[PDB]
Each structure stands twice: as structure tokens, then as C-alpha cells.
Amino acid sequence: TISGVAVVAVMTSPGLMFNFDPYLQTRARIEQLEKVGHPTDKIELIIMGGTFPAREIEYQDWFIKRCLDAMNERESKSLEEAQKINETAKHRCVALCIETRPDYCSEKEINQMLKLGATRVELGVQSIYNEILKLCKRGHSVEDTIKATQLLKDSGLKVSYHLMPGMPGSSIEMDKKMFKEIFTNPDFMPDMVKIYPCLVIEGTELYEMWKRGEFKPYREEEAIEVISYAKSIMPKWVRTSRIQRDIPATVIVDGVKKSNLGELVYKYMEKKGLRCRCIRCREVGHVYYKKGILPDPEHIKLVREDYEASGGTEIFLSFEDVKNDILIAFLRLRDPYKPFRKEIDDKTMLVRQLHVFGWEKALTRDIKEVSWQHMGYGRMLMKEAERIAKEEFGKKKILVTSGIGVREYYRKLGYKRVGAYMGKEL
């Protein structure tokens, strides 16, 4: 199904076809999407590799500048100019996700990521168990993941965990406990998770372990059991990725090779009566595609759910059809714990995310065009966030983590640039 936001994923230098040129990769993806009539006025830029924050700042600044240059369709003198231009370009960068190892997520690196316009950070967590991490000779600890998570949350950023069921030393029950722990231990509480079973690819450490008889990866049945359990307990405030991989089956030495793992999981959950209520399962566009129904306006309500995370409080505000359990929009509001950014006081609330599910063309369903933006849901969630911040938590200013290409939207709501954020005095 076609989304209103175009995902443009690019690869950093040690993809192959363009010798890792940031501009060429970004341009080629945009043109490829325009070829098949997908909208490209809103772009989520994804920096792939996981080592980008460890590269020279000169390289990072230039790489993001050139991506924005491709979106702007013109050269710029500097990162900051490319960002300013992009605020009103035809192809706006509404979100920027950087993948990183959890030990490459210091305050200094977070400052740099904010400078670049980052709105989401994906940590290569893999496992929350130090036994498993050291057994596979990973370069980080769970303590790194916990600290990274806190620093990211207290800087207003969205946090994603890449997680790998079925690593060496793990078990079905251990993996299930990991997912339970990630959603009920405040040290974790990620906003989104990307899950795929551990695979055996030639030329990796896991391949060496496999050859020695130290590692037998999950088959489909094990992966489906774990992921089905994980989805059955995922909170309503967690967003999951489409279960998939961009790794061809002719490179998987051992492990799950089939390409419909997500569909297999769905059918397993049907058979077992396991319900899914996380964001992807309930979002208006996916429900329509999967079940053919739309929100019932007689039952749309503003809903709130709070939880403790990284020493502070997360407030998850949503508009939802509460009869049919269909999610229309949401806002992530946080009372921070131990911020370090100069713009975040102990009288500051953080709007870490505002998302109104918009234009969506379901080719396989017959109401083709469906949208929920420009209906007032975003503004009503922002107003409720401001009221909660001021009246309930006694805060005096509210800072919004804004994509470069979304700053204008918050200006319309009375926000102004405050350092790396869009802010408003309450």
C-alpha cells in the first residue's frame, strides 16, 4: 500500500551502484518513487550503516547536506542553508532517522544528530542480555542501551530498538522475557522496535559460530512463536516495522529464508486468538487495508495513557475510534528526567512526536483515497499537550522535536525556533 510519506533510505561509505553518493542515492530513490506515482512531497530520510555517528563531523554534515540538496533540487553553501531551503521545498524532509550502535550515542553525538535535523534514532540493541552480547562479540552492553535510551528521550528524540530473537545462547522463553521486559521495565520502553530473527550470513562472526556447531538459528516455527508473543504484548504506544528483510535468500546460509514471515505471524495470531493493539496494527490505513473498515465518528475520542520511562513520564495522547479500536493520530509528550540540552529546563515539557495518519492509496481496496489531516486532529492533540504541560505538570515552555520540513507547521501554531527545537512559552 502507498503511503503519503516517501521513505528514502541511503547508505554511507565503508548504494553500490552510486558509489555511496548521498545526492545520487537520494535523487535516484525520489525519481524511482515518482515513476510509480508515489507522493514524494514528504520524505523520511533514513541513514543506514550504524556507524554514521562515529564518522568525522565533516562527513556527516556533508552527507546530510547533499541528501537535502537532492530534495531541494539545488546546490547549497552549507548544511544549515540546505536545511533552511528544505523547509519550503517541493520534497520536504519531515523525518530523519539515524541508525547507531548504542555505545556511539553520547551527549556529544546526540548534539550532532540534533544539528543534522534528526528526529529518530535506532539503536542496534539486538539483545538486552550481556551474556548474549558478549557471546556474539557485540561491541556494546545493555547498560549502553539503557543510558543511550535515557539521553535520547531527555533530548526529545524518538527511540527505536533493533532486536534479534534467536541469537546464540538465547531460547524461546528467554526471548519472550526480553520483549516483556522491554515494555514493562522503565530502563527500556522504546517508541518502536524492528524485529527479525538472527540469521547466518557468510563472512560474519555468527557464521563462524554456526560452523563450529555453537549456533543453530531459529526456523520459521520458532520465529513465529516469539514474534507472535511479542506482538501480543506490545503496548498501544509501540510502533513496529513490517516484519521483513532486504537480505536475499541466496545469502542466508541458515535461518528463516521465507519472505512472508509477517504474514505467517498474522495467521498464527489468528489461529491462537492473539490480539495486536500496537500502533501499526491499529493505524487507520492498515485497518482499512486489512479489514475494510473506517473510523466510526460517533466513537472517536481523545485518549491518554501514561507510563514511566527512563526516569521520567511519557504521556501518549491519541485520537481513536474506541469502538473499533482504530488509531487516527497520536502525540508523544514527555516530562524529562535528566536533560542536558541547553534549551531544556526543569520547567520544560517535550513533544517528542506528533503524527496524524494522512493520505493513503490502497490499490487493493475500493475507497482509493483516504486521509485524516487538515481535520484538526493535530491541532487538538497539540492543544491538549499544552494544557497538560501547563495545568497538570506546571511547566512553562514546551519544546517540539520537529522535522526540518515540518517546522512551518509548528510556526502556524505559534511555535518559534528554540535552538534545535520549535518552542512555545506556556
Residue numbers in the entry: 74 to 87, 123 to 534
Sentences from the paper on this structure:
Elp3 acts as the catalytic subunit, but the loss of any of the six subunits results in hypo-modified U34 tRNAs in yeast, indicating that the complete integrity of the complex is important for its function. The enzymatically active Elp3 subunit of Elongator contains two functional domains, utilizes multiple cofactors, and conducts a unique uridine base modification specifically found only at the wobble base position of tRNAs. The two domains form a cleft that contains several highly conserved basic residues, which bind and accommodate the tRNA anticodon stem loop (ASL). The current model of a radical based Elp3-mediated cm5-modification reaction is proposed as follows (i) Elp3 recruits SAM and cleaves it to generate a 5’deoxyadenosine radical (5’-dA) in the rSAM domain, (ii) Elp3 hydrolyzes acetyl-CoA in the KAT domain and (iii) an acetyl radical is formed by the products of the two domains and (iv) is transferred onto the C5 position of U34 in the bound tRNA molecule.
We used full length and truncated versions of purified MinElp3 in crystallization trials and obtained well-diffracting crystals for monomeric MinElp3Δ1–19, MinElp3Δ1–46, and MinElp3Δ1–54. We solved their structures using a poly-alanine model of DmcElp3 via molecular replacement at 1.9 Å, 1.9 Å, and 2.1 Å resolution, respectively. Although all three versions contained various lengths of the N-terminus and also showed no signs of degradation, we could observe interpretable electron density only starting from residue V72 in all collected and refined datasets. Therefore, we believe that the N-terminus adopts a highly flexible conformation in the absence of substrate tRNAs. The main difference relates to the Fe–S cluster loop region (aa 87–123) and the Fe–S cluster itself, which were both completely unstructured in all monomeric MinElp3s. In our MinElp3 structures, we could not locate any bound Zn-ions and instead observed the formation of a disulfide bond between C384 and C389. In addition, we observed that the acetyl-CoA blocking loop (aa 466–486) is positioned outside of the acetyl-CoA binding pocket, interacting with the last visible residues of the N-terminus and also contacting a neighboring symmetry mate. We have previously reported that the ASL of (Dmc)tRNAGluUUC is not sufficient to bind to bacterial DmcElp3. In agreement with this data and the described importance of the extended N-terminus in MinElp3, we observed that the central basic cleft of MinElp3 is not sufficient for efficient ASL binding. The affinity between the truncated MinElp3Δ1–46 protein and the ASL alone are comparable to the one of an unspecific polyU sequence towards full length MinElp3. The first 45 residues seem to have a particularly strong contribution to the binding and deletion of the complete N-terminus resulted in affinities comparable to DmcElp3.
